[PDB]
Design a protein around this ligand. Structure first.
Ligand SMILES: Nc1ncnc2c1ncn2[C@@H]1O[C@H](COP(=O)(O)O)[C@@H](O)[C@H]1O
Ligand SMILES: Nc1ncnc2c1ncn2[C@@H]1O[C@H](COP(=O)(O)O)[C@@H](O)[C@H]1O
Ligand SMILES: N[C@@H](Cc1c[nH]c2ccccc12)C(=O)O
Ligand SMILES: N[C@@H](Cc1c[nH]c2ccccc12)C(=O)O
Lengths: 321, 325
């Protein structure tokens, strides 16, 4: 079973979920999946300390609510596993300054500059085979491959060289007000996105404002060139209900845009309400969250420590007694 | 309540009699007055490539040498940096409270050469700040080459405390031995010309040979007189002898009246090499007792970790991490 590593920022849209996470939830027996809530990456940007703590627990409960199973997979909070920072320092010594400077000055903090090395350590600790990345993480993954190959050439094969996982994604979900732009969790305009915790009244409101077209009479037809918004609304509904585009075009024959939007909103919220019930149950049980964090960190450290031991032996450290 | 003192010991090279007589010899006798911490910094060492087994051996060499000098593991905390994970943990965290420009203005860093150095060489001042701040250190006894590093640690501590309240203590800073063949240049652990240097582990014979070649002057006739400007060589040998024996410069001047530079060199070799023979005796017994060094490292890492973990827990609480359950 291939080992898969994903870092989860403690800060998700229906795009993240239906395009990737929903299917990964069903892949936990074919793969050894690892989910790392990267609170040590989050602190490269200031925020109120209690907000970060709350958001770490939020993120853990959301992943559990989505269906990540702590027995089948390894899920944990990065700072609870000291090996991440330990390996991260060691790998600084096998990273060129020029590699970090060429991926994005006197007033930024050194964590902003150095966090690609920590990311490399996150991955390499677990003998990871596969990393699912957004396109904006491509050069970070490539650095981790180069560090692994460079270290291996010096000391022998210590690290697995990880590969990108190409999704075979469940859906492509576009921004509600920019149907040519992919829906992104980092979008500063939140009316483009539907977050997984949004209530049905918020969902209907964002769906009702989604851009359509000026066709008269209005017609529900898939056409990415001339009807991008209506096409995106059909793709969202298809991602939720599994119906093909032709079935949906038939279902909405003789219907206006208001009706398509209402049914998309109702279908999205039907999906999210089940997710939110599970979320509230996990999030409101902090005793259970602590057990998951405790179990996951010790499972993670058990494997991470085997890799660090090999790394420390290879670079020349006296083994800890 | 005793002030906390933190020193980082590089597991590489050879300590000189300048290192010893100028600093380490006195700290050996201050172990009851201060809470002294000695950290053998193997995580800093790997910013420079070397054969891995050499670094492992050098780590043990350095431990055995600090013990031979008289660091008492029952009075002071002595340990190997990599055995205490909190060093790397706080080191990462403090990256996020360090300005890029602070590291880029480090004198040794301050284009093409820049791209080729490893990121550890760029980032180790932050790890150094972590090393110090983990132990609520009050005093860091450090040489001139580390003044900029100590100031960065003070800046980081102050800017972290200003954000989060009082978490870190703000540290403060705390003989005359010149190069044997260049007596205007201080004797340096890092000198490429070994003949300038007397290492703590060189045996009498090599020490004696190096001392007899030490530069003096061409005064006619030769006179053992103290004068740093005009007789730097003779003056260095007098200062070395004075640092070893505790005799004043006036006492030695009288002692050498009518004597020649060869007599002065002979006394310096005897006095120095006497200091070294006692030191080496302790070194070889400690160094060959692997059981003993293991127990010292285990104990010291345990004591170090107990303090560092308290600090890191407070740092992690202040920053906003969920506490490890
Ligand atoms: N709007 C979206 N529609 C479909 N899939 C998405 C969307 N956003 C992210 N993904 C998936 O999630 C991963 C990237 O997520 P992120 O890390 O948020 O960029 C990739 O595997 C994508 O297939
Ligand atoms: N040749 C020397 N004479 C006197 N003190 C020295 C000498 N070399 C090093 N030291 C002391 O050793 C400490 C640190 O040495 P270093 O960092 O190697 O220059 C400082 O307290 C110095 O004063
Ligand atoms: N850089 C990633 C988070 C991350 C940290 N370590 C990782 C390792 C693998 C994948 C992702 C990560 C992000 O911003 O989203
Ligand atoms: N930078 C120091 C070693 C060191 C690491 N951490 C320290 C903390 C305090 C004093 C010294 C250190 C040197 O090369 O000599």
């Amino acid at each position: 079973k291939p080992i898969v590593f994903s870092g989860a920022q403690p800060s998700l849209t229906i795009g993240n979920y239906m395009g990737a996470l929903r299917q990964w939830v069903n892949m936990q027996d074919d793969y050894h999946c690892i989910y790392c809530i990267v609170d040590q990456h989050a602190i490269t940007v200031r925020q109120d300390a209690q907000k970060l703590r709350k958001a770490t627990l939020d993120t853990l409960a959301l992943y559990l609510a989505c269906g990540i199973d702590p027995e089948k997979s390894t899920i944990f909070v990065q700072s609870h596993v000291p090996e991440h920072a330990q390996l991260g320092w060691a790998l600084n010594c096998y990273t060129y300054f020029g590699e970090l400077s060429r991926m994005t000055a006197e007033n930024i903090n050194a964590g902003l500059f150095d966090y690609p090395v920590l990311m490399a350590a996150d991955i390499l600790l677990y003998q990871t085979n596969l990393v699912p990345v957004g396109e904006d993480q491509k050069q970070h993954l490539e650095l981790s491959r180069d560090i692994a190959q460079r270290f291996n050439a010096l000391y022998g094969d210590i690290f697995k060289v990880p590969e990108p996982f190409i999704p075979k994604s469940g859906a492509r979900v576009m921004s509600l007000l920019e149907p040519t732009k992919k829906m992104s969790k980092s979008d500063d305009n939140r009316n483009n996105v539907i977050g997984l915790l949004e209530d049905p009244k918020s969902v209907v409101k964002k769906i009702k404002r989604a851009v359509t077209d000026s066709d008269e009479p209005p017609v529900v037809r898939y056409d990415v060139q001339n009807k991008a918004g209506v096409s995106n609304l059909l793709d969202i509904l298809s991602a939720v209900t599994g119906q093909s585009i032709p079935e949906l075009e038939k279902q909405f024959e003789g219907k206006m845009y208001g009706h398509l939007k209402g049914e998309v909103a109702d279908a999205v919220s039907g999906m999210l309400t089940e997710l939110q019930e599970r979320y509230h149950r996990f999030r409101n049980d902090e005793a259970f969250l602590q057990q998951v964090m405790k179990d996951g960190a010790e499972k993670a450290s058990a494997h991470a420590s085997r890799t660090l031991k090999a790394v420390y032996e290879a670079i020349g450290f006296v083994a800890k007694p």
